[PDB]
Amino acid sequence: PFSKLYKETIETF
Amino acid sequence: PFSKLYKETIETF
Amino acid sequence: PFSKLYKETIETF
Amino acid sequence: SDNPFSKLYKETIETF
Amino acid sequence: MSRRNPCKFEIRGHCLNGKRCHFSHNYFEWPPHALLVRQNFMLNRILKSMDKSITEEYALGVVGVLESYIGSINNITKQSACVAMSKLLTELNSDDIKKLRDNEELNSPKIRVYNTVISYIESNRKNNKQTIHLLKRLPADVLKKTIKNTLDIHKSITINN
Amino acid sequence: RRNPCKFEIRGHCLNGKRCHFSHNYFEWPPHALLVRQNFMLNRILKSMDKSIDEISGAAELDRTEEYALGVVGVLESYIGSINNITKQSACVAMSKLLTELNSDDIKKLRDNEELNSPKIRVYNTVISYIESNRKNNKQTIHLLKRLPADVLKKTIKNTLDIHKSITIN
Amino acid sequence: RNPCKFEIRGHCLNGKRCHFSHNYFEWPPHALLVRQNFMLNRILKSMDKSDRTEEYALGVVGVLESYIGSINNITKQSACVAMSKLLTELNSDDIKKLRDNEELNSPKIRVYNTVISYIESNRKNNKQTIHLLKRLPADVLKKTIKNTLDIHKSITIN
Amino acid sequence: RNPCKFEIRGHCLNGKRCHFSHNYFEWPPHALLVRQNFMLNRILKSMDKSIDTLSEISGAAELDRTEEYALGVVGVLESYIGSINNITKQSACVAMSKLLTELNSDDIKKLRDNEELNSPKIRVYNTVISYIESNRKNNKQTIHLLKRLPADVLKKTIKNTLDIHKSITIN
Ligand SMILES: [Zn+2]
Ligand SMILES: [Zn+2]
Ligand SMILES: [Zn+2]
Ligand SMILES: [Zn+2]
């Protein structure tokens, strides 16, 4: 949920 | 409740 | 409390 | 035991 | 900064017609009047968005409902009049009644009336549900005199200060 | 002294002391102040809205012309069964239209109808959809969700009609 | 057809009976300006946590300026309710702008951070702030007030 | 009579002692416009939630300090990225949260829509939009997430949001 966003932030940037 | 609205909608459309 | 205000209202009107 | 209002008590004294 | 024609839906709030809107949604290019109208519509929204208070009585208005209650016409129930009176209290501002109160000569009977109405406006601001509970407990002549004096004050403030 | 910040016109300048522009409203032209108010109002309201969430990161599942369409486009496109719109996502846009509406304007429409006119019942239904959505929009969405296809389509159709009615005139 | 006077102050409660205009498109700009001031005041007051005419005459400032020179029926339990309101009128940002102009180790910085924290704490909880202001030594309370008043005076007068 | 300066910034506190106008109907537009701005500012702080519950979060109080007040949020964040000015990770997460509160998702979506359907910017925009929205639902949880981010990744998240901040604003 906030884990989902952690994932996508690493995958970006 | 939201119950009364479910009926109300169905009846009116 | 709200009885404070009831007591008052009686008096003023 | 530490609340903000009690530090702010002592804060006011040490300052004024 | 290139004045264009404002979107009418944007004036009333937020345009919902996606990119198929060929109107200005950019405020930098709006005439000032468009910007003044929009703010009034938005303020209304901001105000309704902070409310967890709760037939043809609509024609009457909150005012007409209450005058009917006082005048014993149109069959207004006590509950409906307390509810409307809470809408009227919501519309008034203690600070205004205070300046009215200040014009009064020492020991004027109208002073006590003003302080009680302030108590209702303030009481209605903290818990309108509990304030309605109170207005329902009042003797019906006392409730009618109370309403009456608040509509008096309401009418009084509005027309001149 | 200087021109209006421009970071300030949109909210609050976050550049601290480095900024050479004016943060002092006394020296601002009227238009700037009008623009600021608009941006600031839009923010205040947004901050009271209960987010219907970070579902833009879900453009992985491929439904991305919801911006070009807009809420109305999406609703119109769910109704005439085009452009693949999920009931679920059209319940969402529905909630966004009902936030955009004012009950009082509808009440005004209801006056201009004859007594026993079948529209009074529709207006009244529309009104309590507006009233319900202001409090709990998950449930209203999850109600609209549990509403038959052709009931939903109808509801929305009159909501859009009213929505259009009110603004153009 | 002129703006409804009840509408300028808020919402007209007269229903279909009203002769005047309720349509913001047709209003002169000044009506629209005045209305947003009433409306903003209302929006504010209803996010709050809240003789007696003699006190009103003075004003919150009048009331505080009294207690400093111990006259006009000035009391602690009341001076603190006034103090509370003064702090509500102030915000931190102006104090910081004032703080940014004092040289290093200049003692005013410490009063500024105390006022700031009075503002912030007054915003969390006015009752416990008043509780606290009512707990102080009179001479120290009179100094806090004296200082906040100055701050208040000078933010506006330029 | 002239509008009352105090009243232009909020509410006069001087009683009948005050010689100036508190009657909005006799005010020039400009005084009315400026007041509506000071007033909006006040409203936004009280319903700010996150602007009040920050007493309770680490790295926050350092943002209220002289040196950093002068820098502002943007300055504080540039200094974190730049490794000058001794900024704690937990401070730049709070500052980050402040920068996102200042942005509006729909401006990014309009920037998103100008891009091509092969632009690498589209992914960065959607991640930013998801930060703005998360921070609005729950900034405590968003500040928490920010702080878990590897320093290098976090600094990139900030740099992109700073760039976006600028592009929205001047054009
Ligand atoms: Zn449009
Ligand atoms: Zn600036
Ligand atoms: Zn009217
Ligand atoms: Zn004044």
Author numbering:
A (entry chain H), B (entry chain I), C (entry chain J): 8 to 20
D (entry chain G): 5 to 20
E (entry chain A): 1 to 54, 69 to 175
F (entry chain C): 3 to 55, 59 to 174
G (entry chain E): 4 to 53, 67 to 174
H (entry chain F): 4 to 174
Pull verbatim passages from the article behind this deposition.
The events that dictate whether the HRSV RdRp either transcribes or replicates are unclear, although the components of a replicating RdRp and a transcribing RdRp are different; the replicase requires the phosphoprotein (P), along with the large catalytic component (L), whereas the transcriptase additionally requires the M2-1 protein. M2-1 is 194 amino acids in length, binds zinc atoms, and exists in solution as a tetramer. Of these, the best-characterized role is that of a transcription factor, in which M2-1 is thought to enhance polymerase processivity by suppressing transcription termination both intragenically and intergenically. In addition, M2-1 interacts with both viral RNA and P. This ability of M2-1 to interact with RNA and P is required for productive transcription, and each monomer within the tetramer can potentially interact with both an RNA molecule and P at an overlapping binding site, suggesting that binding of these ligands at each binding site is mutually exclusive.
We present the crystal structure of M2-1 in complex with the P interaction domain, at a resolution of 2.4 Å, which defines the orientation of the M2-1 and P moieties in the heteromultimeric complex. The electron density difference maps revealed a continuous area of density not accounted for by M2-1 and which appeared to be a peptide that exhibited helical secondary structure. On the basis of this model, we propose that, in the absence of RNA, each M2-1 tetramer associates with a single P tetramer, with all four P binding sites of M2-1 being occupied. The M2-1/P interface includes ionic, hydrophobic, and hydrogen bond interactions, and the critical contribution of these contacts to complex formation was assessed using a minigenome assay. There is a total of 10 plausible hydrogen bonds, with R126 making what appear to be important salt bridges to E104 and E107. There are a multitude of hydrophobic interactions along the length of the P peptide, highlighted by L148 of M2-1 packing against L101 and Y102 of the P peptide. The root mean square deviation (RMSD) on superposition of 158 carbon alphas is only 1.097 Å, suggesting very little structural rearrangement on P binding. The M2-1 side chains of R126 and Y134 move to satisfy the hydrogen bonds, as described in Fig. 3, but other than that, there is little movement of side chains required to accommodate the P peptide. The loop on M2-1 containing S58 and S61 (19), which are dynamically phosphorylated in HRSV-infected cells, appears to be slightly more ordered (the electron density for this region is clearer) in the complex crystal structure. The simultaneous incorporation of altered M2-1 and P proteins had an additive effect on minigenome activity, with most reduced activity exhibited by combining mutants R126E and F98A, which reduced eGFP expression to that of the minus M2-1 control.
